[PDB]
């Protein structure tokens, strides 16, 4: 309830004119007050529409000011062009900045003038520095200047923040004012004709610098920001890659004193174990060279902080490192060219000096792993291998990007890259031919996509046809669904938390063992991911083919095999001007159904093969190896105690034993820590990388101005929890500026906190961070009922595509691969399901969402609507709340910190109740009926459809099950058992279980099975209504936790809930 005051001050500051007028609009769920709001509205518009002073009425209608709820504020203000400079000249009295063109290796990666690199606009491209966000730099500057203006009279630590950010913003505004501000077009692009006389990389530098200086709260933050902002203006290729590299060594220097553990059964369990840090001597010399590069690039204060920290190697000063490790990735992306980014990967050194003893074992281990994965389904003759074709055609992801193509649906032309639409096209013209796999050769090389991420290389993406997916689908699904019952993969270690993705950095650590951890992200072009990998899988397929007798399965397996045959020789379309290059690349990357598990397999075989060579010089027992695609760590335990020389020699042996296979590596051995791209542990404490650029994006999505405010707030929340903290007021300023909409050149509307923070399809943020909010009042109920009525909208483009011939044909062809006695129950169902993935096509989503926003605006302008009773969640919570009773409590501190970078209130909760004892309610459609259909088919009929289908007679249900391949005897047994009344109740239990509101970012981490939280929740037991008592206890926990987060103190609760309200609520439970 504070946002709106900052909104008012922002409006007053930005416009400032006599002509700038401000027009509230209100609402109330109470008839009389609502009609008085209507009145107020009318009279205000009239008075505005009559050149009368508006300031007189504002006293008379005090009632609206006290009890009504705000929606929005309108604004009539004229063009007033160029006001940014007219404000900004004062905050720019320092000296501007000069680039240094002789820093980056390439020529165009320097921050030189555009015209020196792009004389013609026809060859200009903003894609090498595109912020890719529908908000301007001028917007960012306006926000910064307003913040600076309002914080112009404070005298505290706040003033030290203001002086620091003022000096930084002076450096920035000095750099911009040297030339001026670029002006956005309607699309938020920056054309050639504005950037012609300015540096090419000024905008990204500006945005990133704003993001950094808005995240300054201390002196060391100021040092970091001044030392990165002045070098990120020139260096754009060797900065985040440089400073983020030493961290991998630093983790091997932090003594553990107190630890968190994880079980095989995936539960945290703290340990007071102490572990030293047996670091060798030569890695310090490496680290010094890295700091020498750091100083040689032009960094002075931040080497000083890393060198004076090593005098003590304490863990209390250590979050600084983590802080630094996050300050590197908030400088922007290194959006270089498709060509040179591919050539970062497409440099190869293949040699006739490697072993053969290694590759043969490698091939065999891959073979064996494949057989372990595939023994059960290949043998027991599973439907999904038999019906692999249909399985892949249902699971066609509708963003999949195979080969842009000119289509026509009746009377249109479409340039879709989506493979579902391509399949719809190819079914009609007789070209659908999944058994005949296309080649990938000179006659048909592959396109590319570009994956950028700061501090690392630009990675590449294959863009394949749609036959390869269909071939790979069934086998890879059985592989995943097997190996998540098994070690060595992220599918087994993943839900949200600690006790997961790693969960065994910290069992097998002491002064007996070590751990070798290794980044393997460059190992895609390597000589060990070519021929042996493919031939190993091919051999395994031969074994598995001889391990079955049915013929569709042999066909599917032979097609997967032939896919690996064709992918063994693979060329790559890349244009360059007029001519087209195609390069020999017979190796592995993503853009495939297979890449994750197969890379994990190959790395597993590789590390298992390497690890049988250290045994020639050491005695150890391998306790654990873990592989998640392109990373790997192995722990190993010894017959004796560890030394510095053994770690060093082991590292050299690892490096040279990879060198024997012509494989580059930075071998890293340690005792307490690891480092990988996204996270790391030091001293038995998990930190994380907070490298999510807010004001600069990777690529250009398809969302609106609106939703980008929500993504930016989500990234803010994440980065804040991770450690990187930005000023929340700035984020709110951006949200209002991005939800602002131009109805004309001079009319502009601004919504309020009570529209953006309400649970709907229009939610953007929350009134109190780290807490979703619900509604006990009339008013949230009112607007939620209103907005739920409006979420359901239409798309004429979708309507005409779904009314064409190819869509009908597609449903029919899907159908005819199965039985032919259901025509109005599933064909409509499959069409309704395909509709859920036609919306991926951007113009459909844009039509629907622009229509949705227009429907919103035609009740933001004029008064509001009651929406006719359509029930939602807050209706229920409104009835649950008035039988609670609070009392002040006092919990002690008995739980350990193991995520230091969190805010102190969240940590205080962790420091008073426990971290996660994880639970499960359903691992997907478990109840009675989908685990039969998923055994005889793959089809996934929606629970709406089942809730209807069970309500029908038992005859056409019997027909429907027989139509899905099932025999008659099991249907007869199902009807005789009388389970349909049970699966009504199980399905409605599953409907209440669909409430996903346990995992938003702060509820993600808290343990609700705690005894300390539970003794506060004194709700007596009634019985025979499990859903209600479940949700009541859950909701009471959420009340306690949210009060704790927002206020720190604790409370107890009590709900002597009447039986009458249990029953009155029971019918609204299992609806909506």
């Amino acid at each position: 309830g504070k946002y709106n005051l900052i909104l008012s001050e922002y409006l007053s500051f930005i416009y400032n004119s006599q002509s700038a007028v401000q027009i509230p609009i209100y609402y109330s769920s109470n008839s009389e007050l609502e009609n008085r709001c209507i009145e107020f509205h009318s009279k205000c518009l009239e008075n505005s529409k009559n050149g009368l002073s508006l300031k007189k009425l504002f006293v008379e209608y005090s009632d609206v000011i006290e009890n009504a709820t705000l929606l929005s504020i309108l604004s009539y203000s004229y063009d007033k062009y160029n006001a940014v400079e007219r404000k900004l000249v004062k905050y720019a009295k320092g000296k501007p900045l000069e680039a240094d063109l002789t820093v980056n290796e390439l020529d165009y990666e320097n921050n030189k003038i555009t015209s020196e690199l792009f004389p013609t606009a026809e060859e200009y491209t903003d894609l090498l520095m595109d912020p890719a966000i529908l908000t301007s730099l001028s917007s960012n500057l306006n926000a910064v200047m307003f913040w600076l203006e309002k914080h112009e009279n404070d005298v505290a630590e706040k003033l030290k923040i203001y002086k620091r950010r003022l000096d930084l913003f002076t450096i920035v505004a000095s750099t911009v004012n040297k030339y001026g501000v670029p002006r956005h077009n309607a699309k938020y692009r920056y054309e050639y004709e504005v950037m012609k006389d300015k540096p090419y990389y000024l905008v990204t530098w500006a945005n990133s610098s704003i993001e950094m200086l808005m995240s300054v709260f201390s002196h060391e933050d100021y040092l970091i920001a001044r030392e990165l902002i002045v070098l990120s203006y020139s260096n754009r290729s060797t900065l985040a890659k440089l400073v983020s590299s030493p961290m991998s060594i630093l983790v091997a220097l932090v003594d553990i004193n107190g630890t968190f553990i994880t079980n095989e059964e995936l539960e945290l369990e703290f340990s007071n174990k102490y572990v030293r840090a047996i670091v060798p001597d030569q890695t310090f010399d490496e680290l010094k060279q890295m700091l020498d590069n750091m100083r040689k690039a032009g960094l002075t204060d931040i080497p000083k902080m890393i060198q004076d920290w090593l005098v003590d190697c304490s863990i209390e000063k250590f979050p600084l490192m983590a802080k630094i490790y996050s300050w590197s990735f908030h400088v922007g992306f290194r959006k270089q060219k498709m060509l040179d980014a591919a050539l970062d990967q497409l440099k190869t050194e293949y040699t006739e000096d490697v072993d053969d003893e290694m590759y043969r074992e490698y091939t065999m281990l891959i073979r064996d792993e494949v057989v372990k994965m595939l023994e059960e389904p290949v043998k027991h003759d599973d439907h999904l291998l038999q019906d692999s074709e249909l399985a892949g055609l249902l699971s066609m992801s509708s963003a999949s990007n195979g080969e842009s193509r000119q289509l026509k649906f009746g009377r249109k032309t479409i340039f879709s890259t989506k493979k579902n639409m391509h399949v719809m096209d190819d079914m009609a013209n007789g070209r659908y031919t999944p058994g005949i796999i296309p080649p990938v050769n000179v006659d048909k090389p592959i396109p590319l996509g570009r994956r950028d991420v700061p501090g690392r290389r630009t990675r590449i993406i294959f863009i394949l046809p749609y036959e390869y997916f269909i071939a790979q689908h069934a086998v890879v699904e059985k592989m995943l669904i097997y190996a998540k019952h098994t070690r060595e993969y992220a599918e087994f270690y993943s839900q949200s938390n600690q006790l997961l993705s790693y969960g065994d950095v910290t069992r097998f650590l002491s002064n007996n063992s070590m751990v070798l951890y290794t980044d393997v992200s460059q190992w895609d072009s390597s000589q060990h991911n070519t021929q042996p990998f493919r031939k190993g899988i091919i051999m395994g397929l031969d074994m598995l083919a001889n391990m079955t007798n049915d013929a569709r399965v042999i066909q599917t397996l032979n097609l997967y095999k032939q896919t690996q045959i064709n992918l063994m020789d693979s060329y790559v379309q890349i244009p360059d001007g007029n001519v087209i290059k195609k390069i020999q690349y017979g190796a592995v990357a993503s853009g495939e159904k297979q890449t994750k598990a197969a890379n994990s397999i190959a790395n597993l075989a590789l590390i298992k093969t390497v690890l049988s060579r250290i045994s020639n010089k050491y005695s150890f027992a391998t306790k654990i190896i873990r592989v998640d695609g392109d990373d790997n760590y192995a722990v190993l335990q010894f017959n004796t105690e560890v030394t510095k020389q053994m770690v060093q020699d082991v590292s050299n042996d690892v490096r040279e034993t990879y060198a024997r296979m012509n494989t580059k590596v930075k071998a890293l051995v340690s005792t307490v820590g690891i480092e990988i791209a996204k996270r790391y542990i030091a001293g038995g404490k998990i930190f994380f990388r907070a490298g999510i650029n807010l004001l600069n994006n990777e690529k250009k999505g398809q969302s609106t101005q609106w939703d980008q405010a929500a993504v930016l707030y989500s990234n803010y929340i994440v980065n804040r929890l991770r450690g990187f903290e930005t000023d929340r007021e700035f984020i709110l300023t951006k949200i209002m500026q991005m939800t602002s909409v131009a109805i004309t050149g001079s009319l502009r509307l601004f919504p309020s906190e009570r529209v953006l923070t309400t649970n709907s399809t229009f939610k953007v943020f929350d009134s109190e961070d780290f807490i979703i909010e619900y509604g006990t009042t009339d008013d949230e109920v009112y607007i939620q009922r209103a907005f739920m009525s409006l979420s359901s909208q239409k798309s004429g483009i979708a309507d005409e595509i779904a009314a064409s011939s190819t869509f009908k044909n597609y449903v029919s062809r899907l159908s005819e691969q199965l039985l032919f006695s259901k025509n109005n129950i599933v064909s409509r169902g499959i069409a309704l399901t395909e509709k859920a993935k036609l919306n991926s096509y951007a113009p459909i989503s844009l039509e629907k969402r622009r229509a949705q926003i227009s429907a919103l605006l035609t009740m933001l302008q004029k008064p509001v609507t009651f929406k006719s009773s359509k029930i939602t969640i807050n209706d229920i919570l409104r009835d649950i709340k008035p039988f609670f009773t609070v009392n002040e409590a006092h919990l002690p501190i008995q739980y350990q910190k193991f995520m230091p970078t969190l805010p102190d209130n969240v940590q205080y909760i962790i420091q008073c109740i426990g971290s996660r004892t994880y639970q499960i309610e359903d691992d997907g459609s478990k109840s009675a009926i989908s685990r039969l259909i998923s055994k005889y088919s793959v089809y996934k009929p929606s629970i709406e459809e089942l809730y209807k289908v069970i309500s029908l007679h038992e005859n056409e249900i019997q027909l429907y099950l027989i139509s899905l391949g099932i025999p008659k005897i099991d249907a007869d047994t199902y009807v005789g058992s009388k389970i349909y009344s049970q699966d009504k109740y199980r399905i409605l239990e599953s409907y209440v279980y669909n409430l996903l509101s346990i995992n938003y970012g702060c509820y993600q981490l808290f343990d609700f099975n705690s005894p300390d939280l539970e003794k506060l929740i004194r709700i007596p037991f009634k019985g025979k209504i499990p859903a209600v008592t479940f949700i009541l206890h859950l909701y009471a926990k959420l009340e306690v936790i949210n009060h704790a987060i927002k206020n720190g103190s604790w409370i107890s609760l009590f709900c002597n809930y009447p039986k009458s309200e249990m029953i009155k609520l029971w019918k609204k439970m299992w609806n909506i």
Binding site: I278, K288, L310, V642, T643
Partner: peptide, 28 residues
């Protein structure tokens, strides 16, 4: 600069001495 840099290289040698290493080193 480099006088202090070399002393920084040196202080991470004397520090964090393991016991088995000095035993085998006295013997060796």
């Amino acid at each position: 600069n480099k006088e202090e840099s070399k002393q920084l290289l040196e202080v991470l040698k004397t520090k964090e001495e393991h016991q088995k290493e000095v035993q085998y080193e006295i013997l060796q």
